[PDB]
Design a protein around this ligand. Structure first.
Ligand SMILES: Nc1ncnc2c1ncn2[C@@H]1O[C@H](COP(=O)(O)OP(=O)(O)OP(=O)(O)O)[C@@H](O)[C@H]1O
Ligand SMILES: Nc1ncnc2c1ncn2[C@@H]1O[C@H](COP(=O)(O)OP(=O)(O)O)[C@@H](O)[C@H]1O
Ligand SMILES: [Mg+2]
Lengths: 898, 192, 67
């Protein structure tokens, strides 16, 4: 009754979906009062659907309803748009999530799950007997609100969401104010860092630093404050090793900021006169504070090179702070210069140079999270303008990542909208008119674009659009400062020399290797090396061994034949020693068990590739597998998946998707232009299914998505916000689907000629220089697989004995010189030979109970000869087939095959 | 009706156009800025030697430099004008934002150091000498004085070489190639 | 020597303001090479002549209907 069970499961799933839709309909119209009078025809249709659902429920207790609900879903679009206009942050949600959040009449718990989508840095909401106590950040930090907010039973979602939005700003300001007062009282930051949230401590420390630096500039002494900041840094580094995880993150971020403070003070100390000292002080970012402001939230303003910007006091949690390179400071300066006249800050340069992260760091320094969009050809004028009117109402800063990917027509069409937004911001217009709909304009909004010019399949910005932005170039980032500061944060003893050695070794590997199209060794690989070295400190310590092990595990699997020898020579030359490799006994045993149960044979190269893949994926989230056709990529990752399932016990689900078989509209999605609803694609559907977690097992299971096709750029840089550390999928309709930590993406391809650097650096690449399996091992495994697909033991033994290694290898080497149409390597054709021979023996086994051993062996040898002929020289002419049958006759007591 | 829009070739004509488009120190700073913009736009044309590639400086850069200059003059009103700070901001942020290479950044910094040097006996070009403003003059008188000292300037035949401070070989090569192209085209057109 | 002919023979030059002010045509077509624009020139001319420009870029069907 498997078919009956499947039908029952499908009916149960459909009934669950219909029940959820009916619950949403009851929440939006059937439960709330003074809400059916907005649309009378829709109210009557909802009443009829309610009557039909009640009749169906009574019949079940004693498809048409779902179809009716889907049909009346079109009539709810105007109400959903009005609801979005009520609370501006709802523009980052789809229609289904909007119904879910508006149908929560009294449960008030589905709102908490969406806080990452609406806000960006808030995960859940703390509840205490029907009262919100505070909001919880993504990184585990707990914020307690200034005062508790009571919830009414008949209250609406958007009103209490707005008062929570204002209460968060008020609470963050209160924590900043009393933290700054405590630091003004003369206490040390070591006792404050375990009391308040990270943002308040950071802002108070920056204000204190700029006040003390200006006081020191009123004189000409700098040594005392430099020594004091050095002692504070040493104390924070001492406190780092003896604290919990949240305090560890907070102390790491404050140590980054204090290292920047010490760098600025040291640069100011090395001045010769006072004019250059004042110039250098004006070049860096300052955090002043109003002294006579009657409004609390506008009491902190940021000054840099004479321009002033307002602090928004929005909760950001504990983000991954960035190392303040001089290029980053100049980028902040030009961003402030652009935003002084409400223009759009623009960054152009090669990939992996720190553009989107620089914009995000600027936003975090301005105390607001920056929503990032991933532009694509499917972003037509209506979708992009809807995103713009979504970000104008909220006031959040929009960073249109990969702005070149837009179609040129959309680029020219949105110029009027961008100019209108800029003019409304500059002239102080209360309302603007986009899409024939007057909308409010929050004065805090801004737009940024980060484009990567000079690439294949990328459009060019028209000059009438480029005049509304301010291009800044970041071709050359400072890897040395980033490496030094991060390694000092981690706790390495000799940070400066180790970072200089790392950077010099990276440049040596970039400049002294075979120039192939995927050897990209910029900043992303260095960041990956440091992130992989972070777990290694537990079992290798802070030293050279951790660095060389991380360099191996990150860089080595993406190298060829001579390049890995060059890398090993450089590693021995530039570093003092190479550490003892990991024991890795358990993972090797699990891999060998998985290969034994999968029929593969563990050679040296295949086991090396599997171990490299495992150690690469342990930190990296998205991987690209590159090699020849029929090299063993699928076998490698399937075997490693089975090994992981054996070792950890977590169940694995694999969702193999072929990229080029499907169009983009069927892969990610497509806006239905008939009446503007979002139809899910396939990858988006998988992501939403794993995010919602109806089944309840994806929390304790790994999810692997394989893109088993070529890397078409038009398909791959639609995911640039997914591959990088953003870990969100920015849909056209504003839906921000996050990427869970157990969601990994594998790319299975053969060539990288048409791909772009924007996706090679984002993934840990794995290169297959040659085949992972020998000929004889592959033949043995194929024979075992064909036998498993089915006296018999004696027949199998004699068949395996007939495949003599020397004769078979001689025949395979002799077959290479023939002229082949539709050229295939003889490695790939062995599957046909094995399957054909096994099927012929299986077909002729019915008369094998009454034959002598010699005759049986001769017949089986003849069938094997025929199968080898027709699977090796099958695509050749008659003369070549005659030459090959003569050759196989010579190279094998065997029965003659003519 | 058809109109083709192109940048003005003459340096002096560019200065006159930017002056006609537009505290006495604000007028002095915008005059020096107009001269700097004209010089850098003239140097932009020479691709092998003036820069490393083809750049495009438009009115937005001039507007931002003017706004930054008036903001620095307004805020730093103690008459001690931070010329080094203005030089760094203009050569790095405003006019140096679009610059991708490093040699072009160096030549922009050199041009800004020559133009915005902040010396009383300022000599931006071998012909025109601009004295700094006095503290006892009016805005209209200042504008009249600057227009008068701009009117008396005569552009020499080697303005593409002598005014931009460049060796004559590159200018001679570029002008020779352009003259050869236009003369060959008009020779082909004149016969028929 | 190249522009000596223009300097000597011709004693008049026409800019955008003159060609706009001295043309019977109600439609003008403006052209330039890539990565340069003269929209600010037309905005300045409209401001000096005390008129209103409706800047409408092309490329999309909604903007075409508005045009
Ligand atoms: N270590 C091994 N032991 C036994 N068989 C192996 C081994 N490695 C690879 N093979 C065999 O190699 C054959 C081809 O490899 P595989 O199926 O993994 O290709 P692939 O990476 O998916 O290639 P492509 O996607 O380019 O077609 C398979 O039939 C597999 O059984
Ligand atoms: N202090 C830093 N400065 C610059 N970049 C950094 C720093 N720390 C980390 N990075 C890395 O820089 C990368 C920025 O990516 P980016 O090049 O902006 O992407 P895109 O080109 O798509 O905008 C991040 O992946 C991050 O790992
Ligand atoms: Mg980016």
């Amino acid at each position: 009754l498997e078919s009956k069970l499947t039908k029952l499961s499908e009916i149960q799933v459909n009934w669950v979906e219909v029940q959820f839709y009916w619950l949403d309909l009851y929440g939006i119209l059937g439960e709330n009062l003074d809400i059916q009078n907005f649309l009378p025809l829709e109210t009557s249709k909802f009443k009829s659907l309610t009557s039909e659902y009640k009749m169906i429920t009574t019949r079940a207790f004693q498809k048409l309803t779902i179809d009716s609900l889907k049909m009346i879903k079109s009539s709810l679009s105007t109400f959903l748009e009005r609801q979005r206009r009520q609370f501006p942050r709802f523009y980052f949600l789809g229609n289904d999530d909007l119904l879910k959040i508006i149908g929560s009449g009294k449960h008030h718990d589905q709102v908490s799950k969406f806080m990452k989508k609406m806000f960006g840095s808030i995960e859940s909401i703390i509840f205490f007997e029907d009262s919100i106590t505070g909001v919880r950040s993504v990184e585990g930090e707990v914020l307690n609100l200034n005062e508790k907010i009571e919830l009414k039973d008949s209250i609406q979602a958007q009103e209490w969401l707005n008062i929570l939005d204002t209460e968060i700003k008020l609470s963050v300001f209160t924590q900043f104010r009393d933290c700054l007062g405590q630091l003004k009282d003369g206490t040390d930051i070591e006792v404050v860092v375990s009391k308040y949230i990270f943002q308040a401590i950071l802002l108070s420390a920056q204000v204190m630093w700029t006040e003390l630096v200006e006081k020191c500039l009123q004189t000409n002494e700098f040594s005392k404050y430099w020594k004091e900041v050095d002692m504070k840094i040493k104390g924070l580094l001492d406190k780092l090793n003896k604290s919990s995880d949240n305090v560890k993150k907070k102390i790491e971020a404050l140590l980054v900021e204090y290292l920047h403070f010490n760098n600025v003070i040291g640069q100011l100390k090395n001045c010769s006169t006072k004019e250059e000292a004042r110039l250098l002080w004006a070049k860096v970012q300052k955090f002043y504070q109003k002294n006579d402001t009657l409004d609390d939230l506008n009491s902190v303003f940021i000054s840099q090179s004479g321009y002033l910007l307002q602090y928004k006091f929005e909760y950001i949690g504990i983000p991954e702070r960035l190392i303040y390179t001089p290029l980053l400071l100049v980028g902040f300066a030009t961003l402030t210069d652009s935003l002084h006249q409400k223009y759009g800050g623009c960054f152009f340069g090669p990939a992996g140079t720190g553009k989107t992260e620089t914009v995000k760091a600027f936003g975090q320094n301005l105390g607001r999270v920056v929503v990032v969009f991933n532009c694509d050809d499917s972003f037509d004028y209506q979708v992009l303008s809807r995103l713009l009117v979504g970000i104008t109402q909220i006031g959040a800063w929009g960073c249109f990542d990969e702005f070149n990917r837009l179609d040129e027509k959309v680029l020219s069409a949105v110029s009027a909208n961008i100019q209108q937004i800029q003019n409304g911001l500059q002239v102080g217009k209360s309302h603007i008119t986009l899409l024939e709909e007057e909308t409010p304009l929050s004065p805090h909004t801004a737009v940024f674009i980060t484009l990567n010019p000079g690439y294949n399949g990328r459009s060019e910005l028209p000059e009438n659009l480029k005049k509304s932005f301010r291009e800044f170039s970041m071709k050359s980032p400072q890897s040395g400062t980033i490496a030094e500061m991060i390694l000092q944060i981690m706790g390495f003893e000799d940070s400066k020399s180790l970072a200089s050695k790392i950077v010099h070794f990276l440049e040596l590997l970039s400049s002294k290797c075979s120039s192939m199209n995927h050897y990209h060794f910029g900043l992303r690989t260095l960041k990956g090396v440091l992130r992989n070295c972070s777990p290694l400190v537990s079992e290798f310590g802070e030293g050279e061994k951790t660095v060389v092990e991380s360099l191996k595990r990150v860089i080595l699997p993406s190298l060829g034949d001579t390049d890995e020898l060059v890398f090993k020579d450089e590693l021995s030359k530039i570093f003092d020693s190479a550490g003892t490799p990991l024991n890795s006994k358990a993972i090797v045993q699990c891999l060998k068990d998985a290969g034994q149960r999968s029929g593969f044979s563990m050679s040296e190269e295949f086991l090396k590739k599997c171990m490299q893949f495992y150690y690469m994926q342990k930190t990296q989230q998205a991987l690209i597998l590159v090699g020849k056709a029929g090299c063993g990529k699928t076998a490698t990752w399937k075997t490693v998946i089975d090994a992981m399932a054996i070792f950890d016990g977590h169940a694995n689900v694999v969702y193999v998707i072929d990229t080029k078989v499907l169009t983009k509209e069927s892969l990610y999605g497509s806006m239905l232009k008939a009446t503007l609803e979002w139809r899910d694609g396939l990858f988006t559907s998988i992501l939403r299914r794993v995010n919602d977690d109806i089944t309840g097992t994806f929390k304790n299971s790994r999810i692997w998505v394989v893109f088993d096709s070529d890397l078409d750029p038009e398909y791959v840089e639609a995911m640039n916000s997914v591959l990088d550390d953003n870990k969100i999928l920015t849909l056209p309709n504003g839906e921000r689907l996050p990427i869970p930590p157990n969601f990994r993406i594998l790319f299975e391809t053969d060539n990288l000629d048409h791909t772009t650097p924007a996706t090679i650096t984002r993934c840990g690449l794995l290169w297959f220089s040659t085949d992972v399996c020998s000929i004889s091992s592959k033949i043995d495994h194929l024979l075992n697989k064909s036998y498993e697909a089915l006296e018999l033991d004696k027949l199998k033994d004699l068949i395996s004995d007939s495949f003599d290694m020397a004769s078979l290898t001689n025949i395979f080497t002799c077959s290479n010189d023939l002229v082949h149409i539709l050229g295939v390597r003889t490695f790939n054709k062995l599957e046909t030979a094995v399957q054909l021979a096994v099927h012929l023996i299986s077909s002729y086994r019915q008369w094998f109970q009454n034959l002598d051993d010699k005759s049986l062996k001769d017949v089986i040898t003849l069938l094997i000869k025929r199968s080898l002929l027709y699977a090796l020289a099958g695509d050749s002419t008659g003369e070549s087939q005659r030459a090959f049958i003569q050759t196989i006759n010579t190279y094998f007591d065997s029965q003659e095959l003519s | 009706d058809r109109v083709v829009y192109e940048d003005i070739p003459g340096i002096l004509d560019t200065v006159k156009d930017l002056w006609g488009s537009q505290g006495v120190w604000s007028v002095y700073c915008t005059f020096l800025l107009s001269w700097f913009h004209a010089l850098i736009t003239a140097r932009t044309r020479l691709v092998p030697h003036g820069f490393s590639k083809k750049y495009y400086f438009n009115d937005c850069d001039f507007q931002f430099a003017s706004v930054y200059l008036e903001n620095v003059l307004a805020t730093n009103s103690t008459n001690n004008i931070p010329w080094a700070q203005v030089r760094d901001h203009i050569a790095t942020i405003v006019y140096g934002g679009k610059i991708d290479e490093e040699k072009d950044l160096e030549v922009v910094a050199k041009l800004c150091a020559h133009v915005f040097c902040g010396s009383d006996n300022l000599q931006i070009v071998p012909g025109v000498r601009i004295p700094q403003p006095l503290l006892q003059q009016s805005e209209e008188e200042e504008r009249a004085r600057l227009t008068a000292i701009l009117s008396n300037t005569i552009e020499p035949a080697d303005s593409l070489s002598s005014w931009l401070q460049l060796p004559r070989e590159s200018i001679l090569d570029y002008e020779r190639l352009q003259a050869k192209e236009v003369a060959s085209s008009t020779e082909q057109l004149l016969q028929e | 020597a190249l522009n000596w002919f223009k300097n000597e023979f011709f004693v008049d030059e026409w800019n955008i303001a003159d060609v706009v002010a001295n043309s019977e045509n109600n439609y003008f077509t403006m052209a330039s090479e890539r990565d340069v624009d003269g929209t600010f020139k037309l905005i300045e001319l409209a401001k000096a002549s005390k008129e209103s420009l409706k800047i409408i870029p092309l490329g999309s069907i909604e903007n075409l209907n508005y045009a």
